[PDB]
């Protein structure tokens, strides 16, 4: 067992953090650290930085690494996102993760060049995995990449890279089932992570997931934790917990579905604003903004969810 005696960095409820943007459009790292600390205190187990929720394409590799360092310095368990323009850059994020003392590695597929090519993905994964060989790793899988990591690739990688311990799935319930049935269900150290906000109950109950990366949990941490706890109890055969998890998931479905689309950072930042956190007002691109109707729509759905939850929870 790679992590030995310590509880896995890939278990529990883990927010993918947004990167607060100043008026000058540079990242507010004090605010990032504060939010990170707050979310751990609410019951989250770790954070992910800097992933797509954190606006990685819009920040330099150096900005991201400064962020990671600040979060790690502050005592927050960090899983480092390695999304990058090229392999060399992904690799440098992983080197830095190990150097700085991050607790985990999120290994993202190659983009922009040969993205569909399985042999190129294998070499890219291997480059990243061997760059931080002491840091436990998950592979991120998603239909977005034009490519799917299957059992044969996963285990070929794991044969050479013992730090590969998990699989994070973004795609639908069917893709999750495939991963649970064929990759993550041996009696071993390999675990499945839920990787989209809309697949919580399916992941915990039907797929034996042990952890979940959350976008909406930045905004509704207590409520998302409550869902995961119901799901976990349901996964032990608790009938009442299963029924309650399904209702809470249904109520949370609209707001969670923003995670599935291209505007997830715009939608989740604006919800942070509605919760009163005005550091989430601006975007790194000056012209990126929800429209009037989009705003109206989130406002109504956020109001409806909080009203529902207040009623349902007692």
């Amino acid at each position: 067992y790679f992590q030995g005696m310590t509880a896995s960095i890939f278990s529990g409820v883990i927010p993918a953090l947004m990167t607060p943007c100043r008026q000058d459009r540079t990242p507010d790292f004090d605010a990032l650290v504060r939010k990170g600390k707050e979310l751990i205190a609410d019951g989250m187990s770790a954070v992910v930085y800097c992933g797509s929720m954190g606006d990685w394409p819009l920040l330099t590799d150096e900005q991201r690494m400064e962020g990671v360092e600040r979060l790690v310095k502050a005592g927050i368990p960090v899983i480092v996102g390695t999304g990058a323009v090229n392999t060399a850059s992904a690799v440098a994020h992983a080197v830095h993760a190990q150097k700085v003392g991050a607790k985990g590695l999120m290994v993202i597929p190659r983009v922009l060049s040969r993205g569909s090519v399985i042999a190129a993905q294998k070499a890219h994964f291997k480059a990243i995995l061997s760059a931080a060989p002491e840091i436990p790793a998950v592979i991120y899988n998603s239909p977005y990449y034009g490519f799917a990591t299957r059992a044969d690739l996963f285990f070929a990688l794991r044969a050479e890279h013992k730090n590969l311990v998990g699989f994070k799935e973004f795609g639908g319930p069917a893709d999750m089932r495939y991963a649970a049935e064929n990759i993550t269900s041996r009696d071993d150290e390999v675990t499945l992570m839920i990787g989209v906000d809309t697949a919580v109950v399916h992941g915990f109950v039907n797929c034996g997931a042990t952890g979940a990366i959350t976008g909406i949990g930045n905004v509704l941490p207590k409520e998302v934790i409550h869902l995961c706890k119901l799901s976990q109890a349901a996964a032990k055969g608790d009938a009442d917990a299963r029924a309650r998890a399904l209702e809470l998931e249904q109520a949370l479905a609209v707001l969670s579905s923003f995670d599935e689309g291209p505007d997830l950072v715009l939608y989740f930042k604006y919800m942070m604003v509605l919760k009163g956190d005005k550091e989430y007002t601006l975007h790194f691109n000056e012209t990126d903004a929800l429209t009037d109707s989009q705003r109206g729509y989130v406002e109504a759905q956020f109001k409806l969810f909080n009203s529902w939850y207040a009623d349902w929870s007692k």
Copy 2:
């Protein structure tokens, strides 16, 4: 605000009326008016005539306008359907609607000629909208037409046509979400209408709809109203109402699904017959009829729904 002080013609529960057919296959307008009056008295807010439920392709433009006049004369709030073989005919339905004192306009896409062409749809909508500029209007959207009205078109039309106040969606939950997110959720006079019998809870709860056009509500008015009232309460955050709305919707799903297919008039007329309204026995085409198995199937599903509802409702 276009309608000013009066409650919107596009709110509440609105049946699309069927046109009763005599033995000589001409329309029974006394029966249409009687049914209209009855449905308003059951709690419906307005009616639609003459739409696809009313067999518009099978009736002359003149027959339809006689119908509209009778309904309007009788005190029933009428939303006029403008479905037509060509723009000139659609336009004449709209002129007549304004002349006669109808309360609303359902603006249907061009058919048969250039149906997929967005520029032609724009000109057609504009022709209809400006034909009845004093009558509040909704655009009907449906995958049937080979074409989708998007936010950019809707608002370009609205810039020139202030009577355009609503959007009615027939397509799936995804198409409804798009309309709610991008068209109907500004803090303005623009509202979303549910436009298929199977999308009630999603429309009210998830999409902020304010009204619903109903086919099955001709047959089960009290029960469909009950669903809409549960949904409306659910949309305010009532947990118990949400759970009850989902069960009633599930129970009503088979019968409502007849609205989605090509035989909706055959299925809904025959249900009217089973409820005891024998003016709904015949069709305008002599050869149009449910088959023996189709009849058996509606009979069993109608029996099952009424039995279920009697049990569930107390």
Copy 3:
């Protein structure tokens, strides 16, 4: 044999005529008759009126019948299009065709109401076929209608309706193959008609077609006739004719492809204008018009085709 001793109305090259529109937007029937007479004189065998090329949805049933009468009175062999808003109207076009002395009937599927329902299409076809039992008939088949007439339906109809002698196919080469293999290749009176401008060589050579309805042949009658004659010779095993037919078809492909889309009347009218026939300038809907780029594009493709043909033909 239904037509007995006379050559089939469904053989040869047959234009679907456009309906010239006056400044007052009413049909110019003198111009329609003149064009009809001209096209027969160029080598066409018959005409179709009033089909989708003739703007049927935009004209009243009465306007169409006046047109048909004028063409028939003038000595032009006419195949009557029965496209209509309903069965009763289709039926009245067929009654009128027989009354007036038209030579053939194009039987169009039911639209707008139950269009996908095979049983309803059967009853509609039967209604039309028995309305003009003395007039030889073809069924029009197209993916547009949401429905396909298959061998079993065709032959069930033919068992009761001996005037059904042909099958006209608009869909792709695959749909044509199905019709040739399973419907039209018995040693009988049943023939296949080419029903889209882009399928000439395939229809004659690969599918044993005996006639072709043409849109672009209104504009380029000599050149389309030349293609059909090459194809006919190719269908007898002439190697040189086959090679020449393929080159002419390739050269004609862009211009012919306008037949496949929603703007065919706009594109073919404008080509008539470019050929110098200014009676084809206007459309029945005032707002229907090719855009500036569309015009530029037809102008360039028309120039290129005529230049090519002048060079290629000697």
Copy 4:
């Protein structure tokens, strides 16, 4: 009525039996008979042998017929599966079924040669049906076969073959709806059978099914029977039964979904093993086996279902 006074062989809950495999990889018929007897005693109404659950492709026609005979000799009502490499072999299974005294016939489409050809399927069905004209028959319908039996074929067959009394559907809820609406809902002797483990509630409640063939019911007979009884009560309008049926179906969904895929025999045998029936350890092909992860996954889902059911059921 073909079966006259006796209750239909196609009603109730009917397992498709697996064929236990010895160490020498020959079938254990004592074990098959014992399991059959046990399942009837648990409340099952009949069995199916030898279908795809019974590994038909892996056993000789003679092995299958020995099995059928043993089950019939033991007093178990048997529906004989006629899946075969060719029509002649299918026919010999049907001759043998009638000879031996089997109570029903499952008529499987032609495979391997002309599988998509409706005319060939008709002749094949007719061959099988007339081979055992005294034995009540159902046609098996499935997207697997590249082909669908529609109402017109079903009833053309039934006109000549009065022993055809039922329709078994494997495909989705939509395919079941089509069969219920158009084939099985006349007031006649014709019934619908549920033919995939995942469509129980839909089949009984929404489609008027009267019987269900089950794979998972070999393993969880009491629990599957409990679902069918809830569904049957729900189909009479019992609101409480409907709600309970939906929860039990949801809980059973993962395990039932193994029926939908290519590994159903591997998954259901291994569950039999986990229930303690070690005669289900081996497969006819030596190399056919669940992987380590697949095993882990069934183990966890089986544990979770039993835990859930123990809690939910009181």
Copy 5:
């Protein structure tokens, strides 16, 4: 090199033989041998027996092996088809092939049970390959099987089975390109075989194929050989040969396309009949027959091809 000094059994033009059927519907092996001898004498290099062209599903394993033996005894180089109901039966065809002295092995994917499962296909291929380890082998690839052999599988098999020397592709030009680019183009003993009648020019010219299995070449051996010789010359950069190959392929396309569909044996037998070989009149299933229209269609296309070729060839 596995075949050492001898020319590969997988090069040249190779008919998949049909099995002539007597009046008693048993195979006519004298006629099979005679046809085989004739085709070798016309320039074919080998034959395939018993594949789908030979009606394998309709014949017992023993009938097939008798056929193979007769062909081998007569001096004809035979590639044995291993299509079968199960692995054990496929394996026995391969054992028999080696025993009897067949020159090659066509390795067909598992059907009917686990057909889509790559791991099961691997084990099946391995079973067959090791059953006849002295006989050179190709793997048959086709979209029919619900499964594709990719480079990784091919080469994993080849590492353990040195008799695997070729790849036969039935699917489209794209699937052929994949095989040429990734499997068959190393400077090694591994060759690509064309495996559908419609892909000859693409296979030889664009994909570096070295041999072709032919259905229509049973009927038109000289003409198919002529195409392959043009293609082979084209593949060496001969411009004139390339242009001629494309014309002959186009002329042969309709007749060759019968190979792509479910009726290939019906279509190719009937062509054998039209060529005057009346041993090809009947089918193993009494009810399998081309319809009247299908017959008419082949008759016309066969006439047209022979007429064309007589003209084109001088």
Copy 6:
């Protein structure tokens, strides 16, 4: 007219240059400039740098700008590619293009963040266009981006950005037709560019293209120029040129098709190597390499094309 008196930078044949990689994996700019100079001397009109052919994702923004400067300094007309990780970076490429004296701008859609969102693409295009307002610009359109620039967007941009003069299309013949019909065929300064190696004849002849960006033209400049010259002559109605262009295009089709897939840089570099230019041996990622079979396949297709062309060209 934006470019005034000078010939458009977007006409003629324009290679997208590859970036030669040293043993230390840094770019060889001397070699890039030399190749650029050579290609202009062979008849190319301009070059594109740094696009996807130039490995843009693998090079820093600074490396790219050094390249652009070197090419511009050397007298080569350069169209600058603006593909980038974010808008700010795209913008800096455009600022630099104008500063340095590049002759044109290739405007690439936003990637990685909001790629499918049309409103975000509009703002991105506007940012780039206004960054280099003096430099003539084309928008690159491709299905890759999850998004299509349509006529309405193009012309809305052009209303504010007079330097937008062209449209470059990568997608299929259908997407090219749409652009020719609706965007580029007004009598204005707006031109269509061919943007994939496989669409040359269609672009020039059928779509009125005036220029072509080429990948394979780096390798076969004379032969690609010869195709474009035939196509240009064909576009003036030259019959002989049209026939010759089609044969040369067919011969070049395999090699050109490498442009359509993910390995285009690997395939085109290796062809440069086969032509004897060994500066194209290595890749920026050490592990990126054609496989043995891929190499074999390009070697055979390159040999076949040169042999064919030597024969065909006299």
